[PDB]
């Protein structure tokens, strides 16, 4: 029940791992393509990891419920040729992994973006895998890495080291895609029926953005601070705790905060406002009635009553919420990447001009 893209392009999806180690890049790619058959959560170990994240055999139950659920993109469909596409690198939240934000990835793709959804190896993912050597990769002998749980004494330090690794992973993902764009040969550690040589000369190398949710929102900010190739960033309900104090004044690129209503709190909002400066471009909106999970795919995976019970759904309808976030995002991207599309029709959303939006936030700080 993950919504199809609202844009004119049809959408393909594939996975890329290169190199095969846990120091390499692992990403899910959404792209304009030339069957809506992509497996949403493709391995049992992801369900085990989700169970550990939830602190709960619970894993096998999740598996039975969601294990064959699909997401509306055409698996390994060829790339739509004849044009250069802007690129979004997307960063997932704590306890997530690369496949859980397909509602966003597929909608951006359907509007003509290539979206690289990275899977982080910083031990923030519920689960991820790699191969210990080429021989392991050849027979698909995966080595799994589960979420690390932290002592309270550890949190400050380890979360910051993690957000630094995440930013390095977004930069490495970008460097890989750009290298491929100029013809670098890559051997996908996953043996999939999509030729990465398709991506040669298909990226608009000047129109690069980073987007992310929660832990991924802090990753947006660390990445912008560290990598000037990214031209703008969109932080979806950023969890600001991982960031060091020094970074807040070191973000030159335009930055858009799109918040849920119920996730936010003063300690977090204050850090967002520390990013502000008269000489820099900053916007913020809050989606009325929304919760933290409105930005991820599980908001579409259950019915309304169960969803509200488990806080996967807010008072606002899930499709309406994600549509608002996606349209405001597209308008911001058009403005600060210099796109030649008609997304500026939603410029009003950036300013929070809608029944279901608040300009800035309703939380007040000094
Ligand atoms: C708390 S979070 O939203 O940032 N990460 C997350 C963790 C598990 C999920 F199933 C999911 F959809 C998202």
Features:
366 residues; Rossmann fold; alpha/beta; binds N-[3,4-bis(fluoranyl)phenyl]methanesulfonamide; 10 helices; globular
What is the count of structural domains? 1
Q: Kindly estimate the percentage of residues that lie in beta strands according to DSSP.
A: 15-25%
Count of extended strands: 14
Structural class: alpha/beta
Distance between the termini: 42 Å
Per CATH, the superfamily is: Alpha/Beta hydrolase fold, catalytic domain
Query: If helices are DSSP runs of H or I spanning 4 or more residues, what is the number of helices?
Result: 10
The ordered H/E elements are EEEHHEEEHEEHEHEHEEHEHHHE
Glycosylation sites: 364
EC number: 3.1.1.47
Organism: Homo sapiens (Human)
Family: Belongs to the AB hydrolase superfamily. Lipase family.
Structure, explained:
With 366 residues, the protein is α/β, with parallel strands linked by helices. It has one domain (1-366): Rossmann fold, CATH 3.40.50. It is built from 10 helices and 14 strands. The strands form 3 sheets. A 10-stranded mixed β-sheet has the order 5-1-2-7-6-10-11-12-13-14, sandwiched between helices. Strands 3-4 form a two-stranded antiparallel ribbon. It has a two-stranded antiparallel ribbon with strand order 8-9. β12 (255-260), α7 and β13 (282-287) form a beta-alpha-beta unit. The radius of gyration is 19 Å and the shape is globular. The structure holds N-[3,4-bis(fluoranyl)phenyl]methanesulfonamide. N-[3,4-bis(fluoranyl)phenyl]methanesulfonamide (8U3) is lined by residues 50, 93-96, 100, 213-215, 292-293, 296-298. The PDB classes it as hydrolase/hydrolase inhibitor. The entry lists the keywords hydrolase inhibitor, hydrolase, HYDROLASE-HYDROLASE INHIBITOR complex. The assembly is monomeric. The crystal structure of Lp-PLA2 in complex with a novel inhibitor. The protein: Platelet-activating factor acetylhydrolase. Organism: Homo sapiens.
């Amino acid at each position: 029940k993950i919504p199809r893209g609202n844009g004119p392009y049809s959408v393909g999806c594939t996975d890329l791992m290169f190199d095969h180690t846990n120091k390499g890049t692992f990403l899910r790619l959404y792209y304009p393509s030339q069957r809506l058959d992509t497996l949403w959560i493709p391995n049992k170990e992801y369900f085990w990891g989700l169970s550990k994240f939830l602190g709960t055999l619970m894993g096998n139950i999740l598996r039975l419920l969601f294990g064959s659920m699909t997401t509306p993109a055409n698996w390994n469909s060829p790339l739509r040729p004849g044009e250069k596409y802007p690129l979004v690198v997307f960063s997932h939240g704590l306890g997530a992994f690369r496949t859980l934000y397909s509602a966003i990835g597929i909608d951006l793709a359907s509007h003509g973006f290539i979206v690289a959804a990275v899977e982080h190896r910083d031990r923030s993912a519920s689960a991820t895998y790699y191969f210990k050597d080429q021989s392991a990769a050849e027979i698909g002998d995966k080595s799994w890495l589960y979420l690390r749980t932290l002592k309270q004494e550890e949190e400050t330090h380890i979360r910051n080291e993690q957000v630094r690794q995440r930013a390095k992973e977004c930069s490495q993902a970008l460097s890989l895609i750009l290298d491929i764009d100029h013809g670098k040969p890559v051997k996908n550690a996953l043996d999939l029926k999509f030729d990465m040589e398709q991506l040669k000369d298909s990226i608009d190398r000047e129109k690069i953005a980073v987007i992310g949710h929660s832990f991924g929102g802090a990753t947006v900010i660390q990445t912008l601070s560290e990598d000037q190739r990214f031209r703008c960033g969109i932080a979806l309900d950023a969890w600001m705790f991982p960031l060091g104090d020094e970074v807040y004044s070191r973000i030159p690129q335009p930055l858009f905060f799109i918040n849920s209503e119920y996730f936010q709190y003063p300690a977090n909002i204050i850090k967002m406002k520390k990013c502000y400066s008269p000489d820099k471009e900053r916007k913020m909106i809050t989606i009325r009635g929304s919760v933290h999970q409105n930005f991820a795919d599980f908001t579409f995976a259950t019915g309304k009553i169960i969803g509200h019970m488990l806080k996967l759904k807010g008072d606002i309808d899930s499709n309406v919420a994600i549509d608002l976030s996606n349209k405001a995002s597209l308008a911001f991207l058009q403005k600060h990447l210099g796109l030649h599309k008609d997304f500026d029709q939603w410029d009003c959303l950036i300013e929070g001009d809608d029944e279901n939006l608040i300009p800035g936030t309703n939380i007040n700080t000094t």
